[PDB]
Amino acid sequence: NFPNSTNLPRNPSMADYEARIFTFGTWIYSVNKEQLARAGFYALGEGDKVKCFHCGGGLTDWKPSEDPWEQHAKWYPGCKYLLEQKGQEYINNIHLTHSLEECLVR
Ligand SMILES: C[C@H]([NH3+])C(=O)Nc1cccc(N)n1
Ligand SMILES: [Zn+2]
């Protein structure tokens, strides 16, 4: 499934922060649910799997140190919600950062 790069959300029923929050229920996982919901994510109810309401990009297997906005930018860099909320520049920073990580341990 291709990532949505238009300015229109793939899932408008999940456009509201409050709607996204409800999807998690009791959350046992390593990354905080309010932080996930703030970065556009809602829970699928499949382990720690979340999906962005806008781009539809899915993410599983979250580690405790990992930041929702950073992962959002890393895997779904065409997301227009990400662009609106964080700005190109934050986005490029993240990309430069992860590319330089994926070079200094090699
Ligand atoms: C959040 C985790 N570190 C991660 O990168 N997860 C990921 C990446 C790409 C696809 C899917 N499903 N999950
Ligand atoms: Zn997105």
Side-chain angles (χ1 to χ4, degrees):
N1 227 136
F2 71 98
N4 172 43
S5 311
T6 72
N7 289 288
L8 302 191
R10 195 164 265 176
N11 193 350
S13 75
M14 287 298 113
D16 291 341
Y17 171 85
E18 291 292 313
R20 291 197 299 279
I21 275 296
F22 284 130
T23 63
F24 294 85
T26 302
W27 192 244
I28 61 158
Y29 301 108
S30 60
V31 177
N32 165 277
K33 69 169 169 195
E34 19 287 297
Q35 258 174 240
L36 289 157
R38 275 192 271 106
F41 296 112
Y42 64 96
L44 303 192
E46 294 160 10
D48 71 1
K49 187 162 196 190
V50 295
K51 211 154 158 58
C52 173
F53 83 93
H54 203 276
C55 64
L59 265 2
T60 71
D61 306 317
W62 288 80
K63 273 107 150 200
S65 65
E66 294 181 348
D67 176 80
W69 276 126
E70 284 188 32
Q71 294 298 305
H72 198 163
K74 178 167 194 177
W75 298 97
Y76 307 103
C79 181
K80 290 302 200 284
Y81 178 77
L82 167 74
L83 178 66
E84 178 198 43
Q85 295 306 302
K86 298 302 282 177
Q88 202 92 46
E89 181 169 32
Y90 166 89
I91 295 173
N92 293 329
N93 178 279
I94 289 313
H95 293 131
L96 285 163
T97 290
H98 284 279
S99 305
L100 209 238
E101 287 171 341
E102 207 211 45
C103 200
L104 267 149
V105 284
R106 275 189 175 202

